[PDB]
């Protein structure tokens, strides 16, 4: 009974009802954008590396209608949202630009509106709902940024590219939520497809849609139900650390750097600096193998790379925590688990376990009553990206 069921028809239903009640009318548009689990490729995106996320059935829905009066009126019904649940503001102009503040959940919608590249953007009324656990490491913020962006395209079609929309959503994250993220979470929330993982090349911005085509197996996502303080603080520190190496090795990005390179050039960089880049340059290689493992149906190599990916995160990148360490070591003990790791930024959030669909229900007995803290489970079919339903 720890396993949360998606209930996506219900989430749209609740969003419509709450719109009709709040604004006096049926909403004209529904949009959705999913949260994400990163199978492997941790802390590689911002080092121009490779990531292998898939989109979750956990999503953010905006239901809404254009206004004439050039203002934005928002209601969120998400339980975890900080108060107030409602915010109204005028559209930004040459004169007045939006600014982050209170409430925080609105900062994501403001940021996307502030950097939306097309015109003219009319005002709108919208209800915001999400089944993505808020700050639980499955990209609630990217799904609300991308759900917002998708709603704005219905108001004012952009004439742009998938990467342009990801960088808009990424800019809102940087400027309005003070989180200097890579492109992974936005890219996956835009481009996900049911029954596929998405290999992203964060140097070239090439993307591959890789079938998840053994249904014998599952990905179990485990919510540790913690966020440590160091989370917010440490993500940029790591990022600045990766960039100092790249300075010192005359590389424009760590991507360009290979493990033979870094071992021969230690003297050039810090002992921390060398171990930060040892993850990244290590990780990027492990992903490329994990992609090529997935296509060959080599579940057991992908598994083992995954554990390497955790051990590099835990020991070299130091962005795991005892709770994650303990959900991973606990998963890796269960026969038919190919692999387990922390996913996303770390310091709390979720693990992702690759295992047999028959073995998965053994785990949720076991994890719940052999996990120090409280487990929540998602059994994730790989899902669609950003979607529109005309109402
Ligand atoms: O405070 C933090 C720390 C950083 C991680 C982060 C949280 C909070 C920020 C604002 C409210 C409190 C939780 N929210 C999100 N994301 C998000 N808030 C949403 C609201 C409605 C719909 C979808 C949403 O996704 N991320
Ligand atoms: C990394 C990897 C390698 C191989 C396989 C078969 C993988 O899993 C799926 O194909 C799959 C996952 C979840 N739901 C359905 C299918 C994953
Ligand atoms: O794999 C680490 C990831 O951490 C995420 O939470 C962040 O939003 C991504 O851009 C990426 O840096």
Short mmCIF file of C-alpha atoms and ligand atoms in Angstrom, two decimals:
data_model
loop_
_atom_site.label_atom_id
_atom_site.label_comp_id
_atom_site.label_asym_id
_atom_site.label_seq_id
_atom_site.Cartn_x
_atom_site.Cartn_y
_atom_site.Cartn_z
CA UNK A 1 0.00 0.00 0.00
CA UNK A 2 3.12 2.27 -0.31
CA UNK A 3 2.82 2.05 -4.16
CA UNK A 4 1.15 5.25 -5.57
CA UNK A 5 -1.04 4.61 -8.68
CA UNK A 6 -0.84 7.36 -11.38
CA UNK A 7 -4.64 8.19 -11.60
CA UNK A 8 -4.12 10.49 -14.69
CA UNK A 9 -7.84 10.67 -15.86
CA UNK A 10 -8.69 11.76 -12.24
CA UNK A 11 -5.92 14.43 -12.18
CA UNK A 12 -7.37 16.04 -15.40
CA UNK A 13 -10.91 15.59 -13.96
CA UNK A 14 -9.98 17.39 -10.66
CA UNK A 15 -8.21 20.16 -12.65
CA UNK A 16 -11.37 20.79 -14.82
CA UNK A 17 -13.79 20.82 -11.82
CA UNK A 18 -11.53 23.22 -9.86
CA UNK A 19 -11.28 25.55 -12.93
CA UNK A 20 -15.11 25.69 -13.41
CA UNK A 21 -15.54 26.43 -9.63
CA UNK A 22 -12.75 29.07 -9.56
CA UNK A 23 -13.36 31.10 -12.83
CA UNK A 24 -17.12 30.58 -13.55
CA UNK A 25 -16.62 28.68 -16.84
CA UNK A 26 -15.37 25.47 -18.55
CA UNK A 27 -11.64 25.70 -19.41
CA UNK A 28 -10.85 25.69 -23.20
CA UNK A 29 -7.36 23.87 -23.06
CA UNK A 30 -5.77 20.93 -21.19
CA UNK A 31 -1.94 20.39 -21.36
CA UNK A 32 0.36 17.91 -19.52
CA UNK A 33 4.12 17.52 -19.03
CA UNK A 34 5.67 14.57 -17.15
CA UNK A 35 8.21 14.20 -14.37
CA UNK A 36 11.28 12.00 -15.12
CA UNK A 37 13.52 9.21 -13.72
CA UNK A 38 17.17 9.26 -15.04
CA UNK A 39 18.07 5.56 -15.70
CA UNK A 40 21.81 6.59 -15.81
CA UNK A 41 23.83 9.66 -16.73
CA UNK A 42 23.97 11.51 -13.44
CA UNK A 43 25.63 14.98 -13.20
CA UNK A 44 26.71 14.68 -16.91
CA UNK A 45 24.15 17.02 -18.62
CA UNK A 46 25.90 20.33 -17.56
CA UNK A 47 29.31 18.73 -18.54
CA UNK A 48 27.96 18.35 -22.16
CA UNK A 49 27.65 14.55 -21.54
CA UNK A 50 25.03 11.81 -22.18
CA UNK A 51 21.90 11.04 -20.05
CA UNK A 52 19.28 8.25 -20.39
CA UNK A 53 16.06 9.50 -18.71
CA UNK A 54 12.52 8.30 -19.28
CA UNK A 55 9.29 10.32 -18.70
CA UNK A 56 6.93 9.20 -15.83
CA UNK A 57 3.09 8.86 -15.78
CA UNK A 58 3.51 11.31 -12.84
CA UNK A 59 2.74 14.72 -14.50
CA UNK A 60 1.69 18.36 -14.17
CA UNK A 61 -1.60 19.41 -15.93
CA UNK A 62 -2.61 23.03 -16.75
CA UNK A 63 -6.27 23.55 -17.68
CA UNK A 64 -7.00 27.15 -18.77
CA UNK A 65 -8.42 29.80 -21.11
CA UNK A 66 -7.04 32.96 -22.70
CA UNK A 67 -8.06 36.36 -21.18
CA UNK A 68 -8.46 39.70 -23.01
CA UNK A 69 -7.19 41.89 -20.11
CA UNK A 70 -3.48 40.99 -20.41
CA UNK A 71 -3.24 39.46 -16.92
CA UNK A 72 -2.43 35.97 -15.61
CA UNK A 73 -4.61 34.32 -12.93
CA UNK A 74 -3.37 31.05 -11.38
CA UNK A 75 -4.82 28.52 -9.00
CA UNK A 76 -2.77 25.50 -7.83
CA UNK A 77 -4.57 22.62 -6.04
CA UNK A 78 -1.28 20.67 -5.36
CA UNK A 79 -1.20 19.77 -1.55
CA UNK A 80 2.57 20.57 -1.15
CA UNK A 81 2.45 24.05 -2.85
CA UNK A 82 3.43 26.97 -0.51
CA UNK A 83 0.76 29.65 0.18
CA UNK A 84 -1.04 31.34 -1.30
CA UNK A 85 -2.53 28.73 -3.73
CA UNK A 86 -3.46 31.68 -6.04
CA UNK A 87 -1.43 34.44 -7.71
CA UNK A 88 -2.37 37.02 -10.37
CA UNK A 89 0.06 39.30 -12.22
CA UNK A 90 0.11 41.32 -15.40
CA UNK A 91 2.06 40.04 -18.42
CA UNK A 92 5.58 41.48 -18.50
CA UNK A 93 6.28 44.38 -20.92
CA UNK A 94 9.36 46.35 -22.10
CA UNK A 95 8.47 48.59 -19.07
CA UNK A 96 7.69 45.93 -16.32
CA UNK A 97 9.31 42.39 -16.22
CA UNK A 98 8.09 39.56 -13.88
CA UNK A 99 10.27 38.96 -10.76
CA UNK A 100 10.61 35.84 -8.56
CA UNK A 101 9.19 35.74 -5.02
CA UNK A 102 6.09 34.43 -3.14
CA UNK A 103 4.68 31.95 -3.66
CA UNK A 104 7.71 29.85 -4.97
CA UNK A 105 5.62 27.45 -7.14
CA UNK A 106 4.50 30.49 -9.22
CA UNK A 107 8.18 31.38 -9.95
CA UNK A 108 8.34 28.52 -12.54
CA UNK A 109 5.24 29.80 -14.47
CA UNK A 110 6.52 33.40 -14.22
CA UNK A 111 9.98 32.46 -15.54
CA UNK A 112 8.59 30.58 -18.56
CA UNK A 113 6.21 33.54 -19.35
CA UNK A 114 9.14 36.02 -18.93
CA UNK A 115 11.37 34.11 -21.48
CA UNK A 116 8.59 32.81 -23.86
CA UNK A 117 10.09 33.79 -27.26
CA UNK A 118 6.84 34.42 -29.26
CA UNK A 119 4.31 37.28 -29.46
CA UNK A 120 1.72 38.37 -28.93
CA UNK A 121 1.10 36.39 -25.68
CA UNK A 122 -2.44 37.03 -24.29
CA UNK A 123 -3.25 36.71 -20.57
CA UNK A 124 -4.82 33.52 -19.27
CA UNK A 125 -6.59 31.81 -16.38
CA UNK A 126 -5.27 28.32 -15.38
CA UNK A 127 -5.53 25.61 -12.70
CA UNK A 128 -2.13 23.84 -12.01
CA UNK A 129 -2.22 20.23 -10.66
CA UNK A 130 0.62 17.66 -10.30
CA UNK A 131 1.02 13.96 -9.31
CA UNK A 132 4.84 14.52 -9.37
CA UNK A 133 6.02 14.45 -5.71
CA UNK A 134 7.04 18.09 -5.01
CA UNK A 135 10.85 18.31 -4.57
CA UNK A 136 11.10 14.45 -4.45
CA UNK A 137 13.68 14.27 -7.30
CA UNK A 138 11.47 13.37 -10.35
CA UNK A 139 11.57 16.94 -11.80
CA UNK A 140 8.23 18.45 -10.53
CA UNK A 141 9.69 21.87 -11.54
CA UNK A 142 10.67 20.86 -15.12
CA UNK A 143 7.16 19.33 -15.64
CA UNK A 144 5.47 22.67 -14.47
CA UNK A 145 7.91 24.72 -16.61
CA UNK A 146 7.19 22.47 -19.65
CA UNK A 147 3.41 22.21 -18.97
CA UNK A 148 3.46 26.08 -18.78
CA UNK A 149 5.47 26.40 -22.05
CA UNK A 150 3.07 23.92 -23.79
CA UNK A 151 0.02 26.02 -22.62
CA UNK A 152 1.71 29.23 -23.93
CA UNK A 153 2.30 27.60 -27.40
CA UNK A 154 -1.53 27.06 -27.61
CA UNK A 155 -2.01 30.80 -26.77
CA UNK A 156 0.79 31.94 -29.18
CA UNK A 157 2.47 29.24 -31.36
CA UNK A 158 6.28 29.62 -31.17
CA UNK A 159 8.17 28.95 -34.41
CA UNK A 160 11.02 27.18 -32.68
CA UNK A 161 12.90 23.98 -31.92
CA UNK A 162 12.70 21.45 -29.04
CA UNK A 163 16.05 22.76 -27.62
CA UNK A 164 14.92 26.41 -27.77
CA UNK A 165 11.91 25.42 -25.54
CA UNK A 166 14.14 23.39 -23.17
CA UNK A 167 16.57 26.44 -22.79
CA UNK A 168 13.54 28.72 -22.09
CA UNK A 169 12.34 26.31 -19.39
CA UNK A 170 15.97 25.97 -18.18
CA UNK A 171 16.37 29.81 -18.01
CA UNK A 172 13.20 30.05 -15.82
CA UNK A 173 14.77 27.40 -13.51
CA UNK A 174 18.04 29.47 -13.35
CA UNK A 175 16.58 33.01 -13.08
CA UNK A 176 13.28 32.44 -11.21
CA UNK A 177 13.93 29.30 -9.02
CA UNK A 178 17.69 30.02 -8.48
CA UNK A 179 18.67 26.46 -9.64
CA UNK A 180 21.40 26.37 -12.37
CA UNK A 181 20.27 23.05 -13.89
CA UNK A 182 21.42 21.33 -17.10
CA UNK A 183 18.92 20.55 -19.90
CA UNK A 184 18.10 16.91 -18.95
CA UNK A 185 14.78 17.37 -17.03
CA UNK A 186 13.20 19.89 -19.49
CA UNK A 187 14.39 17.91 -22.55
CA UNK A 188 12.82 14.66 -21.23
CA UNK A 189 9.55 16.40 -20.19
CA UNK A 190 9.28 17.77 -23.76
CA UNK A 191 10.43 14.72 -25.82
CA UNK A 192 9.46 11.58 -23.83
CA UNK A 193 7.50 8.91 -25.68
CA UNK A 194 5.54 6.03 -24.17
CA UNK A 195 7.57 2.79 -24.04
CA UNK A 196 10.91 4.58 -24.76
CA UNK A 197 13.89 5.95 -22.84
CA UNK A 198 15.51 9.09 -24.34
CA UNK A 199 19.34 9.15 -24.82
CA UNK A 200 20.23 12.87 -24.85
CA UNK A 201 23.54 14.13 -26.26
CA UNK A 202 23.99 17.39 -24.28
CA UNK A 203 26.91 18.41 -26.58
CA UNK A 204 25.24 18.00 -30.03
CA UNK A 205 21.59 18.00 -28.68
CA UNK A 206 20.99 14.88 -30.80
CA UNK A 207 18.39 12.66 -29.14
CA UNK A 208 17.64 8.97 -29.55
CA UNK A 209 14.31 7.32 -28.69
CA UNK A 210 15.27 3.82 -27.44
CA UNK A 211 12.45 1.24 -27.07
CA UNK A 212 11.85 -0.29 -23.65
CA UNK A 213 11.09 -3.70 -25.39
CA UNK A 214 11.34 -6.42 -22.73
CA UNK A 215 8.01 -6.19 -20.79
CA UNK A 216 9.41 -9.07 -18.63
CA UNK A 217 11.18 -6.20 -16.74
CA UNK A 218 10.17 -3.01 -14.84
CA UNK A 219 11.74 0.12 -13.37
CA UNK A 220 10.77 0.59 -9.69
CA UNK A 221 11.30 4.17 -8.43
CA UNK A 222 11.77 4.50 -4.62
CA UNK A 223 11.05 7.84 -2.88
CA UNK A 224 13.34 8.04 0.21
CA UNK A 225 10.96 10.85 1.36
CA UNK A 226 14.00 12.99 2.41
CA UNK A 227 15.61 16.20 1.07
CA UNK A 228 18.90 17.08 2.95
CA UNK A 229 19.92 20.82 3.28
CA UNK A 230 23.18 20.19 1.22
CA UNK A 231 20.92 19.45 -1.87
CA UNK A 232 20.29 23.17 -2.89
CA UNK A 233 23.81 24.25 -1.66
CA UNK A 234 26.00 21.50 -3.24
CA UNK A 235 24.56 21.17 -6.84
CA UNK A 236 26.23 24.48 -7.95
CA UNK A 237 29.49 23.69 -5.97
CA UNK A 238 29.93 20.45 -8.03
CA UNK A 239 29.08 22.34 -11.20
CA UNK A 240 31.76 25.07 -10.48
CA UNK A 241 34.20 22.20 -9.58
CA UNK A 242 33.66 20.42 -12.96
CA UNK A 243 34.27 23.79 -14.76
CA UNK A 244 37.70 24.47 -12.93
CA UNK A 245 39.08 21.12 -14.25
CA UNK A 246 37.88 22.05 -17.83
CA UNK A 247 39.80 25.40 -17.34
CA UNK A 248 42.99 23.62 -16.13
CA UNK A 249 42.93 20.82 -18.87
CA UNK A 250 42.47 23.40 -21.71
CA UNK A 251 39.14 21.59 -22.46
CA UNK A 252 35.97 23.57 -23.42
CA UNK A 253 33.92 20.92 -21.46
CA UNK A 254 34.69 17.59 -19.65
CA UNK A 255 32.92 15.73 -22.53
CA UNK A 256 36.14 16.35 -24.62
CA UNK A 257 38.15 14.81 -21.69
CA UNK A 258 38.70 10.97 -21.53
CA UNK A 259 39.79 8.93 -18.44
CA UNK A 260 43.36 8.32 -19.91
CA UNK A 261 43.61 12.20 -20.26
CA UNK A 262 42.56 12.94 -16.59
CA UNK A 263 44.89 10.23 -15.05
CA UNK A 264 47.93 11.72 -16.90
CA UNK A 265 46.92 15.34 -15.86
CA UNK A 266 46.13 14.97 -12.06
CA UNK A 267 49.10 17.31 -11.15
CA UNK A 268 47.26 20.07 -13.16
CA UNK A 269 44.10 19.95 -10.85
CA UNK A 270 42.89 19.52 -7.17
CA UNK A 271 42.44 16.10 -5.38
CA UNK A 272 38.73 16.97 -5.11
CA UNK A 273 38.83 18.43 -8.67
CA UNK A 274 40.37 15.20 -10.11
CA UNK A 275 37.74 13.02 -8.28
CA UNK A 276 34.81 15.27 -9.46
CA UNK A 277 35.96 14.87 -13.14
CA UNK A 278 36.65 11.08 -12.55
CA UNK A 279 32.86 10.63 -11.99
CA UNK A 280 31.82 12.81 -14.98
CA UNK A 281 34.26 11.49 -17.63
CA UNK A 282 33.68 8.01 -16.13
CA UNK A 283 29.83 8.49 -16.07
CA UNK A 284 29.59 9.72 -19.74
CA UNK A 285 31.39 6.49 -20.88
CA UNK A 286 29.15 4.28 -18.67
CA UNK A 287 25.97 5.88 -20.23
CA UNK A 288 27.09 5.25 -23.87
CA UNK A 289 27.66 1.56 -22.83
CA UNK A 290 24.26 1.53 -21.00
CA UNK A 291 22.44 2.85 -24.12
CA UNK A 292 24.24 0.13 -26.23
CA UNK A 293 23.48 -2.42 -23.43
CA UNK A 294 19.72 -1.51 -23.56
CA UNK A 295 19.44 -1.99 -27.41
CA UNK A 296 21.19 -5.44 -27.25
CA UNK A 297 18.73 -6.40 -24.42
CA UNK A 298 21.94 -6.76 -22.23
CA UNK A 299 19.98 -5.92 -19.00
CA UNK A 300 22.91 -7.32 -16.80
CA UNK A 301 25.63 -4.92 -18.21
CA UNK A 302 23.15 -1.92 -17.83
CA UNK A 303 22.46 -3.12 -14.27
CA UNK A 304 26.23 -3.24 -13.41
CA UNK A 305 27.03 0.19 -15.06
CA UNK A 306 24.05 1.54 -12.91
CA UNK A 307 25.72 0.33 -9.71
CA UNK A 308 29.06 1.80 -10.94
CA UNK A 309 26.97 5.03 -11.56
CA UNK A 310 25.77 4.96 -7.90
CA UNK A 311 29.32 4.13 -6.52
CA UNK A 312 30.88 7.00 -8.56
CA UNK A 313 28.01 9.35 -7.33
CA UNK A 314 28.37 8.09 -3.68
CA UNK A 315 32.24 8.00 -3.46
CA UNK A 316 33.56 10.37 -6.21
CA UNK A 317 30.77 12.95 -6.76
CA UNK A 318 29.56 12.66 -3.07
CA UNK A 319 25.90 13.59 -3.86
CA UNK A 320 24.27 10.46 -2.34
CA UNK A 321 23.12 10.25 1.31
CA UNK A 322 22.89 7.36 3.81
CA UNK A 323 19.12 6.89 2.93
CA UNK A 324 19.91 6.52 -0.84
CA UNK A 325 23.06 4.40 -0.10
CA UNK A 326 20.74 2.18 2.00
CA UNK A 327 17.89 1.93 -0.59
CA UNK A 328 20.51 0.96 -3.27
CA UNK A 329 22.53 -1.61 -1.08
CA UNK A 330 19.03 -2.98 -0.04
CA UNK A 331 17.77 -3.29 -3.69
CA UNK A 332 21.11 -4.79 -4.99
CA UNK A 333 20.66 -7.63 -2.41
CA UNK A 334 17.36 -8.87 -4.08
CA UNK A 335 17.85 -11.58 -6.80
CA UNK A 336 16.41 -10.39 -10.17
CA UNK A 337 17.41 -6.74 -9.46
CA UNK A 338 19.84 -6.00 -12.37
CA UNK A 339 20.89 -2.68 -10.80
CA UNK A 340 19.90 0.22 -8.51
CA UNK A 341 21.15 3.79 -8.05
CA UNK A 342 20.15 7.23 -6.81
CA UNK A 343 18.50 9.19 -9.68
CA UNK A 344 18.47 13.00 -10.22
CA UNK A 345 20.56 15.44 -8.20
CA UNK A 346 20.91 13.33 -5.05
CA UNK A 347 21.14 14.41 -1.32
CA UNK A 348 17.69 12.71 -1.04
CA UNK A 349 14.87 12.00 -3.54
CA UNK A 350 14.48 8.63 -5.29
CA UNK A 351 16.30 5.52 -6.43
CA UNK A 352 15.65 3.72 -9.73
CA UNK A 353 15.87 -0.12 -9.73
CA UNK A 354 15.95 -2.22 -12.98
CA UNK A 355 14.30 -5.66 -12.23
CA UNK A 356 11.79 -8.45 -13.30
CA UNK A 357 8.06 -7.37 -13.17
CA UNK A 358 7.48 -10.59 -11.07
CA UNK A 359 10.46 -9.67 -8.72
CA UNK A 360 9.20 -6.01 -8.21
CA UNK A 361 6.37 -6.96 -5.73
CA UNK A 362 8.97 -8.85 -3.59
CA UNK A 363 10.82 -5.49 -3.23
CA UNK A 364 7.86 -3.35 -1.93
CA UNK A 365 7.25 -5.94 0.87
CA UNK A 366 11.04 -5.82 1.57
CA UNK A 367 12.05 -2.15 0.99
CA UNK A 368 9.07 -0.81 3.16
CA UNK A 369 9.98 -2.95 6.29
CA UNK A 370 13.85 -3.08 5.67
CA UNK A 371 14.16 0.76 4.90
CA UNK A 372 15.15 3.04 7.84
CA UNK A 373 12.83 5.88 6.68
CA UNK A 374 9.46 5.75 4.78
CA UNK A 375 9.34 4.34 1.19
CA UNK A 376 6.87 5.45 -1.54
CA UNK A 377 6.95 3.36 -4.77
CA UNK A 378 6.19 4.14 -8.41
CA UNK A 379 6.12 1.21 -10.88
CA UNK A 380 6.89 3.27 -14.00
CA UNK A 381 5.79 2.45 -17.53
CA UNK A 382 7.88 4.83 -19.74
CA UNK A 383 5.48 7.67 -20.71
CA UNK A 384 4.63 10.37 -23.24
CA UNK A 385 6.13 13.88 -23.09
CA UNK A 386 4.26 17.24 -23.32
CA UNK A 387 0.67 16.75 -24.63
CA UNK A 388 -2.34 18.94 -25.57
CA UNK A 389 -6.04 18.12 -25.25
CA UNK A 390 -8.52 20.70 -26.69
CA UNK A 391 -11.64 20.88 -24.42
O1 LIG B 1 10.84 24.34 -2.49
C1 LIG B 1 11.27 23.48 -3.24
C2 LIG B 1 12.76 23.15 -3.24
C3 LIG B 1 13.29 22.90 -4.64
C4 LIG B 1 12.47 21.78 -5.29
C5 LIG B 1 11.06 22.37 -5.44
C6 LIG B 1 10.34 22.78 -4.20
C7 LIG B 1 8.87 23.28 -4.32
C8 LIG B 1 8.74 24.79 -4.74
C9 LIG B 1 7.38 25.47 -4.71
C10 LIG B 1 6.40 24.85 -3.73
C11 LIG B 1 7.08 24.04 -2.64
C12 LIG B 1 7.87 22.85 -3.20
N1 LIG B 1 8.22 22.99 -5.64
C13 LIG B 1 8.96 22.39 -6.73
N2 LIG B 1 8.39 22.06 -8.00
C14 LIG B 1 7.00 22.23 -8.23
N3 LIG B 1 6.16 22.99 -7.51
C15 LIG B 1 4.89 22.81 -8.09
C16 LIG B 1 3.58 23.36 -7.78
C17 LIG B 1 2.46 23.01 -8.52
C18 LIG B 1 2.58 22.13 -9.58
C19 LIG B 1 3.82 21.56 -9.91
C20 LIG B 1 4.98 21.93 -9.15
O2 LIG B 1 6.31 21.54 -9.22
N4 LIG B 1 10.33 22.12 -6.61
C1 LIG B 2 18.43 -0.35 -19.40
C2 LIG B 2 17.57 -1.46 -19.93
C3 LIG B 2 18.09 -2.47 -20.71
C4 LIG B 2 17.28 -3.48 -21.20
C5 LIG B 2 15.92 -3.49 -20.92
C6 LIG B 2 15.04 -4.57 -21.46
C7 LIG B 2 15.40 -2.43 -20.15
O1 LIG B 2 14.05 -2.37 -19.76
C8 LIG B 2 13.05 -2.36 -20.67
O2 LIG B 2 13.21 -2.64 -21.82
C9 LIG B 2 11.76 -1.99 -20.01
C10 LIG B 2 11.74 -1.25 -18.84
C11 LIG B 2 10.52 -0.93 -18.27
N1 LIG B 2 9.35 -1.30 -18.78
C12 LIG B 2 9.38 -2.02 -19.90
C13 LIG B 2 10.55 -2.39 -20.55
C14 LIG B 2 16.22 -1.46 -19.64
O1 LIG B 3 21.88 14.13 -13.18
C1 LIG B 3 21.94 15.28 -12.34
C2 LIG B 3 20.72 16.11 -12.66
O2 LIG B 3 20.31 16.77 -11.48
C3 LIG B 3 18.99 17.20 -11.88
O3 LIG B 3 18.09 17.23 -10.82
C4 LIG B 3 19.12 18.51 -12.61
O4 LIG B 3 17.87 19.18 -12.78
C5 LIG B 3 19.69 17.99 -13.98
O5 LIG B 3 20.00 19.09 -14.86
C6 LIG B 3 20.95 17.16 -13.74
O6 LIG B 3 22.06 18.02 -13.38
#
